Design a protein around this ligand. Structure first.
Ligand SMILES: CC1=N[C@@H]2[C@@H](O)[C@@H](O)[C@@H](CO)O[C@@H]2S1
Ligand SMILES: CC1=N[C@@H]2[C@@H](O)[C@@H](O)[C@@H](CO)O[C@@H]2S1
Ligand SMILES: [Cl-]
Lengths: 563, 560
């Protein structure tokens, strides 16, 4: 290109005319592909409105049984094909996937389409499209994105499954089917392999759900019939993310009422929740959920006598106090825990903490005082659930925490994340990149804790209408405590809307299961070696910025770990 | 050929090598692999030691049925050093899928496997996994190094003539080129399907105390259940039915195929598996609980009696009762069980009658009369093979005391006896000697087989600890697989050659049972002997070819 530009257009005029456009903009005569750039992107990219076109190629995926695998379709107009509301409408159609044996992954039960919608300017909200056929408006100078996910049943026959998604530019009012030789066809190939991801999650990830948020936003009084229906809706939706929900009400000095099941242990609904195979751990409340006639002592005695008989009792825990800060708080936990043990001695009490007692240090520095918390609490806490931020980037001080615990007597180390750690550590703050979100569970895996807790999934600012704007609480990084959105904000559905962050939590929990499989076959040192040598994850400040390492890892698990 | 003074005056016997000269280069980026390394194939029944002498390379022509493993070995011996600093050098091994003319495939993961043959106590025995499809092997001067190639044909595979290659490449120190040496594999998959359910129940014990000690897994723990689970699943590929085993006072045994309570979903995943021909039910509790021993037993049998797979149950209660008090504890124990289930099969191992009140004036005659003392409180009479010496004609004397039209069965076992030259699995015994265990079992016509132990090592407290053989026993007795962790980082068990010959033998039984089903007992017996495969306990083929003459004759005559 000369100094004066092609044909005298001036400086830098004509550096690629990326192939002349067709002179017509009529979608009934021009291929969709000459009207709109369409390409695929990996599930770990947060695909902004200004992402640049790439050339479309086929998509080749891998999934085990009981695994959700995902990819994205990006669309950016080249022209107006609807002069009067630019740029135009595209119709999106998907199809069953079919193997050689004639087995199928069906549209609707396995295969789903959602639009990726920005929250605070960042790609985050996944809003359902109509199946099998939907329409999507495309705007000038904007990249618009669809999240495709495929849920493989536990019983699915292995094989190579194949299918197509069809994108057609439409003329709006300026029947037939809209699909034609002018349509653009994206080719899908998924290999289902012999692994079944355990039905019961290997890592209990317990996630809190504010009941006050539900009570206010929906307008449902605690105890009511409508309240019980609303909590039911949330509990059932959340289990598909390989997590263990608990409802949570905060009290005086950060005491907590935490309950997985709002139903008395008597009720048939209690066993339907607690004996669900997908639920790895459930909170039992300390006080009564609904106002009773009994005293709490009296209620808890009778609740525990029932639950301790049931075969799911091994999944129970009590969570009594959120971040005890001072000596009175740590004493209160001992007292409450000992009431519990009098009705059943094998009860598991979960305590979260970032610090020893402020008013009576257990050692001359804060970190050292923190390390001794188990010496103070023993034997009145079983699950020592510590803040990851406390470690900074010192993965080598993990041993300092563990050296104070007694694994051989049922004590366990768990971790949580919250307003810290911050960039460039793994977390779920809005603005954090996709791999950074997924790296939360790579870190959890590497460090060797036996469960995980996240304080909040719906912890918005207060609102009194279902479709009210989602506002983020003051003093916290936006996204902290917020993994899903009300459906009514984005459509007329009552079904929750997932965040990208919740999808990358699930994918991370799927990765954990892969790495646990690899470990069960080749040992701890080899599996640690796989995580690092692939480039997936080296340390809290050093993990992959791209997708490809992740496929290298999951592909090596497939190559080596089949039966 | 050569004169007294040798070629060019090299001295006595110099220049008798007809080997054509070597190349003057040793650079493996320029010299064909075949000029740097001798490579040849051997049969699956040779124990190929480190001084096996090179043969000319030829094509491999194999036969298998559906649901059959077939095998061969690849032997490699360096001719020169191609890595001057670390002799002799490294070769890369690469396998590819096998394809028929119709386009069917036998695949590398699932079908074709490669393992290194490693010596144990100086004898070729352990089969240690190589990486697939590409592995590396260090070769050392003046030594023959050996790879075991096995091909598992799926039950549903299309008949056909499948073809492929294994490629061996000397490395410089992925790298395949025109210099690489190519071995040609041709496998005929024929019509026969080998029954999914083994036709002979071969029950194999697995010591639970060995697992608990060596892997540091507390009996009952969740880690223990995982460890037992891994062993069970791995052993079912060998056409055997495992049982875990703890010995008690005076050689009482607690035996159990499943560690899982009978109501647990995992119990029926094990016990209803089509490959499991017989399973052991424990007399007392595996995992200590609240119910007394009689209340546990009745509850368990009630659940099991109702299941479709209950015809496979048996109870193994005493290992080798030796005096009158032992034979009488068995009768008491059995009779307790018959109160809950009259139809239960009780299995008893023995080599002798009661020594303190003999049943007859000589020990062989006392042994033969054991069923008349135990009846009706044993249904499976499992007797020591060693007691017969080389007398196949005295089997009749055992069977004549049994009431086989009242579901009494005759099974056999081997152990520290019999010894050379009889068939057994003692380290040092020859390949076809190991395989002849099942030839003998077939010819003598018992309806089952038991082996006391497959992991019966001396005691150790770390997974990768040296494997030591128990005192007073021929090494290998009681040991058919090794810990994977001794040989790599893997938790998967390592098979012995002897376990592979056991499988080969069990596959031979299914070939002979097919020929019998078509042509009758007397023609089947004639086949076995007139091919040279097996004449009797001290006379059986020392070479592979008769085994192929036998299998090929079954293919030509039962190809329908
Ligand atoms: C277990 C936890 N306890 C605290 C919560 O109540 C919230 O304040 C949260 C905000 O990030 O921080 C920590 S995470
Ligand atoms: C059924 C058997 N019982 C005995 C076992 O307990 C071991 O002592 C073995 C040693 O070879 O010999 C016999 S075989
Ligand atoms: Cl055929």
């Amino acid at each position: 290109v000369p100094v004066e530009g092609v044909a005298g257009g001036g400086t830098a005029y004509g550096f690629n005319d990326a192939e002349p456009l067709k002179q017509s903009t009529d979608p009934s005569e021009v291929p969709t592909a000459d009207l709109v750039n369409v390409w695929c992107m990996p599930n770990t990219v947060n695909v902004g409105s200004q992402e640049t076109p790439r050339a479309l190629e086929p998509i080749n995926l891998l999934a085990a049984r009981n695994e959700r695998e995902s990819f994205q379709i990006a669309m950016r107009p080249k022209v107006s094909w609807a002069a009067s509301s630019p740029s135009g409408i595209v119709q999106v159609q998907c199809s069953d996937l079919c193997s050689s044996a004639g087995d199928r992954l069906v549209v609707g039960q396995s295969l789903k389409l959602r639009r990726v919608v920005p929250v605070l300017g960042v790609p985050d909200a996944l809003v359902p499209l109509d199946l099998p056929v939907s329409q999507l408006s495309l705007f000038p100078g904007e990249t618009s994105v669809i999240w495709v996910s495929i849920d493989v049943p536990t019983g699915q026959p292995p094989g190579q499954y194949e299918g197509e998604i069809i994108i057609s530019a439409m003329k709006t009012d300026g029947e037939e089917d809209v699909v034609s030789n002018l349509s653009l066809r994206i080719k899908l190939r998924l290999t289902v392999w012999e692994f079944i991801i355990p039905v019961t999650p290997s890592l209990p990830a317990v996630i809190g759900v504010s009941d006050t948020v539900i009570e206010d936003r929906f307008a449902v009084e605690h105890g009511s019939e409508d309240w019980y229906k609303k909590l039911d809706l949330h509990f059932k939706w959340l289990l598909q993310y390989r997590i263990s929900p608990y409802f949570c009400k905060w009290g005086e000095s950060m005491r907590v009422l935490t309950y997985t099941s709002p139903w008395p242990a008597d009720h048939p609904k209690s066993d339907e929740y607690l004996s669900d195979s997908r639920l790895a751990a459930y909170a039992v409340p300390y006080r009564q959920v609904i106002a009773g006639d009994d005293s709490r002592e009296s209620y808890l005695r009778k609740e525990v006598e029932i639950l301790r008989s049931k075969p799911h009792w091994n999944k129970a825990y009590f969570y009594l106090w959120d971040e005890p800060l001072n000596m009175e708080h740590f004493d209160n936990v001992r007292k409450m825990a000992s009431e519990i043990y009098a009705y059943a001695p094998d009860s598991r009490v979960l305590t979260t903490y970032y610090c020893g007692p402020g008013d009576a240090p257990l050692a001359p520095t804060p970190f050292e005082s923190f390390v001794k918390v188990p010496n103070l609490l023993r034997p009145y806490t079983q699950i020592y659930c510590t803040s990851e931020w406390v470690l900074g980037n010192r993965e080598d001080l993990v041993k300092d925490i563990l050296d104070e615990l007694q694994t051989e007597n049922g004590e366990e180390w768990w971790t949580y994340i919250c307003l810290g750690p911050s960039d460039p550590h793994p977390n779920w703050h809005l603005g954090m990149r996709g791999t950074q979100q997924r790296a939360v569970m790579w870190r959890v895996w590497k460090e060797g804790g036996t469960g995980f807790l996240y304080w909040g999934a719906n912890c918005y600012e207060k609102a009194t209408v279902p479709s009210a704007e989602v506002k983020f609480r003051r003093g916290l990084p936006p996204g902290d405590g917020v993994l899903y959105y009300p459906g009514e904000v984005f459509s007329s559905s009552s079904e929750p809307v997932a965040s990208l962050r919740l999808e990358r939590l699930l994918s991370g929990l799927q990765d954990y299961e892969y790495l646990k499989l690899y470990e069960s076959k080749y040992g701890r040192e080899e599996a640690m070696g796989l995580l690092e040598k692939t480039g997936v994850y080296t340390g809290p400040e050093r993990y992959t910025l791209e997708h490809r390492p992740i496929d290298v890892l999951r592909g090596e698990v497939y190559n080596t770990c089949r039966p």
